Amino acid sequence: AAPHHWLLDKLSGCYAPRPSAGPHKLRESLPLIVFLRNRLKYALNGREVKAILMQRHVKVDGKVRTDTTYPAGFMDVITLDATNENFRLVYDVKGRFAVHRITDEEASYKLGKVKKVQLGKKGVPYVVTHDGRTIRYPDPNIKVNDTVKIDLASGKITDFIKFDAGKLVYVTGGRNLGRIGTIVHKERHDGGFDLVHIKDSLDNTFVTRLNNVFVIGEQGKPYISLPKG
Amino acid sequence: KGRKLNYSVQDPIANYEAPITSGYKWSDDQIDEFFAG
Amino acid sequence: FEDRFDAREHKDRSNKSRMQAMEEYIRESSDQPDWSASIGADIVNHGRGGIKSLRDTEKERRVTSFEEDNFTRLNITNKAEKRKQKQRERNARMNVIGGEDFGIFSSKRKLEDSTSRRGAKKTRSAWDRAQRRL
Amino acid sequence: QSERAFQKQPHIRWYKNAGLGFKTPKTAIEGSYIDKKCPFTGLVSIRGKILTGTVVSTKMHRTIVIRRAYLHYIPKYNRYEKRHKNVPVHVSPAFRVQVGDIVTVGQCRPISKTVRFNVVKVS
Amino acid sequence: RLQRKRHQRALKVRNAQAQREAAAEYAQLLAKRLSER
Amino acid sequence: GISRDSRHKRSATGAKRAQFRKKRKFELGRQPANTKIGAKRIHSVRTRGGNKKYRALRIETGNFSWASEGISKKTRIAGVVYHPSNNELVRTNTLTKAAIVQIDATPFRQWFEAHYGQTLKIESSVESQFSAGRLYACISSRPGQSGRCDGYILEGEELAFYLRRL
Amino acid sequence: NGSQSIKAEDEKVVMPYVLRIFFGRAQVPPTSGQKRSRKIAVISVLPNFKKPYINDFLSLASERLDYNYFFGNSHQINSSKATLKTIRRMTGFVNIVNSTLSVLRTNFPLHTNSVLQPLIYSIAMAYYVLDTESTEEVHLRKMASNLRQQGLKCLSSVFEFVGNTFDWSTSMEDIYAVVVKPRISHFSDENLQQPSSLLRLFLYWAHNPSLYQFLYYDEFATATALMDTISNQHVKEAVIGPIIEAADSIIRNPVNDDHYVDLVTLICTSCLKILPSLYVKLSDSNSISTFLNLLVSITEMGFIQDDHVRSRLISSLISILKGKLKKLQENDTQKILKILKLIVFNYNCSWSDIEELYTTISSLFKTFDERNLRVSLTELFIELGRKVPELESISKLVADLNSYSSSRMHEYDFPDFINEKPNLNEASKSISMLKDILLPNIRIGLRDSLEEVVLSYMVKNTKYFTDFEDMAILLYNGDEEADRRQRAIKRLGEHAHQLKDNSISHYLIPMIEHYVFSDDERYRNIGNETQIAIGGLAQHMSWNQYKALLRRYISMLKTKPNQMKQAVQLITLRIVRDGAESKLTLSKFPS
RNA sequence: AUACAGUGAAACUGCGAAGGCUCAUUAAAUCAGUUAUCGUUUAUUUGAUAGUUCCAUGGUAUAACUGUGGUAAUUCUAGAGCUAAUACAUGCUAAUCUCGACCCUUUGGAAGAGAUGUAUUUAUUAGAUCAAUGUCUUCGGACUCUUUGAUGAAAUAACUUUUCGAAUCGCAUGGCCUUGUGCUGGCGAUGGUUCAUUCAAAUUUCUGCCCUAUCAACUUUCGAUGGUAGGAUAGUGGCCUACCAUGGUUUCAACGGGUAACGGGGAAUAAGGGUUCGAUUCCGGAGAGGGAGCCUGAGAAACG
Secondary structure (H helix, E strand, O other): OOOOOOOOOOOOOOOOOOOOOOOHHHHHOOOOOHHHHHHHHHOHHHHHHHHHHHHHOOOOOHHOOOOOOOOOOOOOOEEOOOHHEEHHHHHOOOOEEEEEOHHHHHOEEEEEEEEOOOEEEEEOOOEHHHHHHHEEEOOOOOOOOEOOOOOOOOOOOEEEEEEOOOOOOEEEHHOOOEEEOOOOOOOOOOOOOOOOEEEEEEOOOOOOOOEEEEEEEEOOOOOOOOOOO | OOOOOOOOOOOOOOOOOOOOOOOOOOOOHHHOOOOOO | OOOOOOOOOOOOOOOOOOOOHHHHHHOOOOEEEEEOOOOOOOOOOEEEEOOHHHHHHHHHHHHHHHHHHHOOOOOOOOOHHHHHHHHHHHHHHHHHOOOOOOOOHOOOOOOOHHHHOOOOOOOHHHHHHHHHHH | OOOOOOOOOOOOOOOOOOOOOOOOOOOOOOOOOOOOOOOOOOOOOOOOOOEEEEEOOOOOOOOOOEEEEOOOOOOOOOOOOOOOOOEOOOOOOOOOOOOOOOOEEEEOOOOOOOOOOOEEEEO | HHHHHHHHHHHHHHHHHHHHHHEEEEEHHHHHHHOOO | OOOOOOHHOOOOOOOOOOOOOOOOOOOOOOOOOOOOOOOOOOEEEEEEEOOEEEEEOOOOOOEEEOOOOOOOEEEEEEEEOOOOOOOOOOHOOOOOOOOOOEEEOOHHHHHHHHHHHOOHHHHHHHHHHHHHHHEEEEEEEOOOOOOOOOEOOOOOHHHHHHHHHO | HHHHHHHHOOOOOOHHHHHHHHHHHHHOOOOHHHHOOOOOOOOOOOOHHHHHHHHHHHHHHHHHOOOOOOOOOOOHHHHHHHHHHHHHHHHHOOOOOOHHHHHHHHHHHHHHHHHHHHHHHHHOOOOOOHHHHHHHHHHHHHHOOOOOOOOOOOOHHHHHHHHHOOOOOOHHHHHOOOOOHHHHHHHHOOOOOOOOHHHHHEEEEEEHHHHHHHHHHHHEEEEEEEHHHHOOOOOHHHHOOOOOOOHHHHHHHHHHHHHHOOOOOHHHHHHHHHHOOOOOOOOOOOOHHHHHHHHEEEEEEEEHHOOOHHHHHHHHHHHHHHOOOOOOOHHHHHHHHHOOOOOOOHHHHHHHOOOOOOOOOOHHHHHHHHHOOOOOOOOOOHHHHHHHHOOOOOOOOHHHHHHHHHHHHHHHHHHOHHHHHHHHHHHHHHHHHHHOOOOHHHHHHHHHHHHHHHHHHHHHHHHHOOOOOOHHHHHHHHHHHEEEEEEEHHHHHHHHHHHOOOOOOOOHHHHHHHHHHHHHHOOOOOOOOHHHHHHHHHHHHHHOOOOOOOHHHHHHHHHHHHHHHHHHOOOOOHHHHHHHHHHHHHHOOOO
């Protein structure tokens, strides 16, 4: 009854935890019970993960948010107070949620793909992201599928990454879900299979969608740290 | 003129009521000598 | 047309082709040892069961690893146990003789069809087979 | 160009642009045609996907019946049986489409029971 | 009752002096972005 | 009303053997409230959470808009003479959207005499109604959904656009 | 209750003028004090009593806005209004500086002035109260210090009151009593004038006519002072010319030239300002520019100068003869200006202009040969009128060729200034050659041949109407010139004009080849014409996207050969824009 | 503890039950994925988000409760008397925002003019230019056609029986001398209008394994096919009605024929040898005695 992304062992139970509503969707997130209890194993059961949630160790996106099924989606920096645990969780190359450990100056921010820019009411420019941070007043040159950098103390955009040909992009969606390498090709079609294409070890080619891909930095310099093997 | 004036026979109204034999209390001769003019 | 996320094609199967004759030949020509038990420790119910097969001690090692790894006893879940424990022990006393399972020799399943005779490196060109050798 | 009552007019001569690589002809920007559901001035907005094919019949007005044959890699009897599709489409003030006439259409806002596509191109 | 009448009015004027000033305080940042653009 | 579904009817291919389903809640067709003239009574019906819908039946105080200056002012209703979305609707004298109804234009007289001084540049076939009192004006707002009677006056082009019709 | 009282105001007109004046009289009888304040000023006032007075002014504003034609006005309402306004001024200027109730009574006073201006906004030519001077002297003694107070972009309390008082018939009695235009002209001649200066200028321009139609000699001297303000405000309508509302300046300057001729220096300043009205902004329309030049001519018909304004009017005619706009109406006004400029050059100009502009006759071709055989020594406006006739004005083709050859003959008989005049001839022929003309392009080619008076045979064979052996000899002449920035740019412009998207003719490949060969022969001149080669490649690159891209692609490919020869010669440059244009070509590759 | 003070039958309250059997046989129309909704509803999740004030606190009317009773009798009752509210419903409320004539030079703004919302439903329109590294240098400038960038192709005239500008709490005596609660004065949770997201639903683009031409015509006989307008809608929609046109699908398989459609379709887990046994979601839609009509809710034609 589980998805593939959670890295959930089959010998666990019968009812799978539906995440509650929140920032991200159901299909692109993992809740805190499947995060803490059975992935990096700070708990043994739902009772004691509710106990540490009542103790309020979790500090995801700089706020506490004491809830069992809180849908932590892409790169919400899970922060735990004891042993200064800073966790940025991204996608691995085979579809799961690889939770990388980072440090404090990297967990002081996150980034987010812009979805739409609106002239909503009363002359106010407007920007949303995958956690829905409706932050005030970016520059006019925010296209769709660019990348804002959230402040995580206040909410303001601090840095901006422009989407164009020659940018380091992350793909979350479809049969390319979780690949990095961002350059063999660029092809913007007019309604589907439109993208920037991603290399491999032998620099192979790949096809995805615009909304299923979003930028993380430059060719060699992302200010996100990434795990390795 | 599709649904307009279907000259068909319909099921529940075919015996919805029943007639009456004498009907008018007048005679038909009383009709004729009523509105001859 | 368009892509659609398929965990059944980026999921580790590795079991459609796991044949015990090939695996036994690999264990023979492995040139690294095999982690066998101290000899009495692997018989099960004072001999009322078998010894235990190699797949059964692999599965037991996996269960005890998961067991210690997240601090939970497994259970007596009725439907799965009435299937798997009774059918497993009855085919164990059918086919496992002295710690060795001979069930495979009584089973039609072609070796070379699924598990040998490579499909990706099929080399359907004279030039491709020439470059695959040289 | 007024054969019906109830103030045949644009609904706020009027002119807009859907963008996305589809031209607006100059009579459809500034002309006497009303453009009620032609998407260049229109009331509809564009979205979705864009399909291309030749036609079969343009008998009634505001009905463009496209044909669409396409390749599909049949594995069953290992030969390609040829595709055919149909879609009704509202008019545009750019081309009186006759038989032949490969044209393309974009998905928007169901107009009749079966039309979501309106002509944006002729070539 | 009257102490609540103190605190209500004080929190109301503080809410005004926070929100209605902060709104123009990021509208001036929009003005800086528009001047630099 | 009854329905909103294609299941009761045929598509562009000509299919049969329907016998489909018990109709759901979200195929809700309410009764057609033909709004008339009377004393102002609006039924406050519910839908989709607290989505109150104003169903007007006997509305009078139409806010009709002077066109060339855009002056939406308050007046009464007389009757619709031409509306062939139903040619019996004008026989029964109801009040729906896009109908051409008659108005005693006395507050428009008041506004003209108030912001121009004199009484009577404007077209002659509406100057005749400036003199007489009853001018033609077409309803914009939806009393069956928003419960209101707003409209726009007839001034010249739209006037003859309807007067040549009926 | 604000919405309820707004409903009461929207339904507060249904009763007659008697009941409306009765309700207004009851509103006046709240805190009038006509026994105490109808003489000079008030006895006492309070904060809440001024709040009744501020509410009285607000009710007067609402009543006038409701009944915005008649309003039921009465002298009791006028006396209550004057008492309220004087009490507001007295309380605001006599209270101490604590500013709370002072700003309350000041926003009471601005709203009361707004309600006072609403009475004249509603009932202007209806009452015209003969006891106006009481309220006029009251408001003057109140707002004496409002000298430059109404000078802003939005200050429209006393500025709107002054405009209302100036835009009437007989309500200018309080204006011409002592002063309205003095303080209005002080704030108008204030140097920090915002765009209400044009509003005040139009108000005084409309208000000079009432002061002129007034039989009073005081108003006659006030109209003289309004003309004196039009002469002393000679910088305001100059510096405030930021919009297309120059018709107010053209309507005042024609009115001033028709009204008052007071100084020869004033007429010279008016003529120089109307010369700047055509040499300041290029967005002046036809009727405005015609009336401005006619007003310059009307000032020149009175009090022009003999050398300075003579040369200024000659430059005006030398611009207006190159214009000749609006179906010879500007040409007729330019002929009038040339006949009024009063010089020997202007006399020859009026002669040679009237001898050609005689209402579509053969006198143009008669007068061209007439002044050719009798060549005038002015020659500036003559070259202007003979270069407008050499441009795309169909007639006088051989006469245009003779005019260009005669200008060249005068430029060779000079042997300096007439060579700078030939520089203007070449700078006119360049824009003539880079155009869609047919007869004027051939006339510019004839002017190029007359300036060239091998090369002359090349020019006459490029203008030979043969185009096959002619273009072959042009390619061979380019080869001989290969084996000049503006000159080769003009030759390549004439060649590109003769082969400019004319796809109903063959040998377009050899025509573009001759264009690229002349471009290569100019690009070999690296010390001078490298910039011209870069500009020609840039114009061809713009033409590669501007609606037609067949021969412009081969033009791009063959203008790449200059870059290939330059890179083979180099074996420093600007790689940045070249790489960005390579990216643009790669974007055009994904088309 | 002489206006409250702990146990607490029976009553109001917050929520609970938050998803269970049988019966007649639907061929991508039941279903699964997918495209979209600037074509739409949304409780809860999450991020954001309020400026109109003339000559010390507002009203009776009902419970529970007592008391008199009826009836064989109910979570059936009726008179009479009181009594409370975050129940009902009338109503008490400082002055700050820009342009800046003037600046006295830094402690710089005094005068004047223009201000000030939401929720509902109506119309006009804001939504072609200037800056250089260069055309000619006459080492000055009219500069955009070239060489590159930029503002850029909700402001207002009205309705509506209009919602509001905190009768919520916690942590912190803290600062001031207006000579007494005179101003309290710092922050955080709950409010509170609106937007977006999330959740879910409805439509909608397309794709997906029986044999079928002895099914070759169907569709206008629940509009057939489309156009225009209205009604109803959560909105798109012949979804329904007026008028008009005679369309539309099909041999490149329309439309129609049945079951090992108690079986099948990935619908899914796969198992280290069982090769169509071997994990499951769904057979189709209904039904709460029988059809019909109505009501409630973020969600229903309700297992209550």
